[PDB]
Amino acid sequence: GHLDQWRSRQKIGMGKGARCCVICSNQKALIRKYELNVCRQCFRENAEHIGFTKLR
């Protein structure tokens, strides 16, 4: 039915569509290193809180 078809492709959970920023839900330019799963723009704003600092 329509429920079965609804979001069937998304239920697969592979590719860029499955992933998203844990802060802003954007799916573009996601940082997956160390399983941060934060988009680069969000990471720059929240870098100090996470623990990173701008050395060299």
Binding site: Y34, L36, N46, H49
Partner: protein, 212 residues
């Protein structure tokens, strides 16, 4: 198995950033100035720093219990594993977060930008700050946006020691015309114990001991 050390610190940092953002959005009217936590084998002991201690607390701890329930449900804390405490900020004027929120409230109360910014600057310096800088930008006079900066006292900008000697905060103001950015920078004075200072002289200051 158990997470590696790299993953553990990443998880701790992400949790702290989420906790800070939630508290900043929730306790905006209160002078929320920071949060700390200390995980032990017994509980978590999240400590929230604010200026309006009774307001964040609520009546009989009603609001603080509500915040504890929010944090417990969000991070799936077990019963008797999360505990929240409220601590008052020692000096209101030396906290940039408190002052920028106060400036946001003043601007939403439809006050003159110059008068509100000067009032913030005045209170900051009476508090004991070495200097204060306030920035207001956006659609103020009319359609054409403009940014005005009000300064007083000392303020350092370059190097790395400025991060330890300057407290900075920025906030968004939603007016009828549009968004207004407010920034407060406070040159913290020296403190003996580091509660309201870096507990160290300026990086370019040399003092010669008076002979005895």
């Amino acid at each position: 198995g158990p997470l590696s050390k790299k993953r553990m610190i990443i998880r701790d940092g992400v949790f702290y950033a989420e906790l800070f953002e939630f508290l900043k959005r929730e306790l905006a009217e209160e002078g929320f100035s920071g949060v700390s936590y200390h995980v032990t084998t017994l509980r978590t002991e999240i400590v929230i720093k604010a200026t309006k201690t009774r307001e964040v607390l609520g009546v009989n701890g009603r609001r603080i219990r509500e915040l504890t329930a929010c944090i417990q449900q969000r991070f799936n804390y077990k019963e008797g594993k999360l505990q929240l405490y409220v601590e008052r900020v020692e000096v209101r004027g030396l906290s940039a977060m408190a002052q920028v929120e106060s400036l946001r409230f003043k601007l939403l109360s439809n006050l003159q930008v110059r008068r509100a910014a000067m009032g913030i600057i005045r209170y900051v310096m009476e508090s004991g700050a070495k200097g204060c800088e306030v920035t207001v930008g956006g659609k103020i006079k009319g359609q054409r946006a403009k940014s005005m900066t009000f300064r007083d006292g000392y303020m350092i900008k370059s190097g790395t020691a400025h991060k330890s000697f300057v407290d900075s905060a920025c906030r968004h103001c939603y007016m009828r015309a549009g968004c207004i950015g407010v920034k407060v920078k406070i040159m913290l004075p020296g403190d003996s114990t580091g509660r309201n200072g870096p507990s160290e002289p300026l990086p370019d200051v040399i003092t010669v001991i008076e002979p005895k």
